[PDB]
Amino acid sequence: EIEHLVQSVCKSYRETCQLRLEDLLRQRSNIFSREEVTGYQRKSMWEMWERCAHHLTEAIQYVVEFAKRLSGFMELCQNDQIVLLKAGAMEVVLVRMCRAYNADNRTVFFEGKYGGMELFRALGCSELISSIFDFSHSLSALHFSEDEIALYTALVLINAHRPGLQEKRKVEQLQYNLELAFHHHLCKTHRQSILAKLPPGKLRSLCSQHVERLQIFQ
Ligand SMILES: CNC(=O)[C@@H]1CCCN1C(=O)c1ccc(Cl)c(COc2cccc3c(C(F)(F)F)cc(C)nc23)c1Cl
C-alpha cells in the first residue's frame, strides 16, 4: 500500500528533523545584533569552518536516521544503503534548511538566532553562501507542507541513478513507488504545479566546490 509508505516517510521525517517548525517560526523575531554579526566576522576561517563542519555532521546523522526508519530502505543491501546516503545526505540537509530560512528578511536560523549571509564572511566562500541562500529562497517560495518536503527529501535519497549501486532494480522499485505516492498526493491536492518550480544536479553542483574540505574537521 502506497499509503503505508507515505505515512512511514512522514513519520520518520517528523521524528528526524533536528528542530520543530513551530520553534523556528517563534524564533524569527530573534535576530543577531550587528555586535554578534561583528563577533562571527572576526573569527578565523579555521574556527568558523570547524563550527559549521560540526553542525553539518550532526545534520547528516539525522538524515541517516531518516533513511533507516523509512522501511524499504533497510531492505536494500547494505552497500546500496551506503551509496545512497553518501551521495544524497548533504543534498537532503540543504533541502531541509529551507524550513529554517525566512524569505521575508533573507535570514537563516543559526546557533540560536537568525542572520543574513554576511554572518558567514569568515568562511571565505561568499559565492557558496550566496548559492545556499538563493537555493533556500527558491525552495521557500514553494510553501512546502511537512508531508510534501518529507516525500521530496525521500526521492532526493532514493535515486536509482547514483553510481555504484549493486541491486539497481530494488532501488528503481522503491523510487518508482515514492514517485507514484508523490505525484498522486500532489495531483489529489492540486499542488502539482510546484513540480515545475523544483530544482534539477543543481543540488549536486551547489556543494561540489567545497564539500571534501569537511574531512579535516571531525
Ligand atoms: C543544529 N543544526 C543546524 O542548525 C543546521 C544543520 C544544517 C544547517 N545548520 C546550521 O547550523 C547551518 C545553518 C546555515 C548555514 Cl548557511 C550553515 C553553513 O552552511 C555550510 C557551510 C559550509 C559548507 C556547506 C556545505 C558544503 F557542502 F559546502 F559543505 C553544504 C551546506 C548545505 N552548508 C554548508 C550552517 Cl552549518
CA of 169 relative to ligand 1 center, distance in Å:
33
- 206 Cβ below 6 A of ligand 1: no
Smallest CA separation from ligand 1 atom 15, residue = 110
Report the nearest atom of ligand 1 relative to the CA of 53. Answer: 36
- Contact at 8 Å (CB) between 179 and 104? no
Resolution in units of Å: 2.2
Residue 44: strand, helix, or coil: coil
The DSSP annotation for 147-181 comes to: HHHHHHHHHHH--TTSTT-SSHHHHHHHHHHHHHH
**Amino acid making up residue 21:** L
**CB of 55 sitting under 6 A from ligand 1:** yes
The domains of the chain are located at 1-218
* CA-to-CA dists, residue 203 to 12, 82, 115, 182, angstroms: 22, 19, 23, 19
Say how many Å lie between the CA of residue 132 and the centre of ligand 1.
Answer: 9
3-state DSSP: the chain helix, strand, coil percent, rounded to 5? 70, 5, 25
CB-CB contact of 29 with 107 (8 Å): no
CA 159: distance to chain centroid? 15
The experimental technique behind this entry is: X-ray
Residue nearest to atom 17 of ligand 1 (CA): 52
CA–CA dist 52, 28 (Å, integer):
21
What's the CA gap between 98 and 140, in Å, rounded? 6
Ligand 1 centroid to residue 56 C-alpha, Å: 5
Cell of 107: 535570514
Give the span between the Cα atoms of 100 and 25, in whole angstroms. Answer: 8
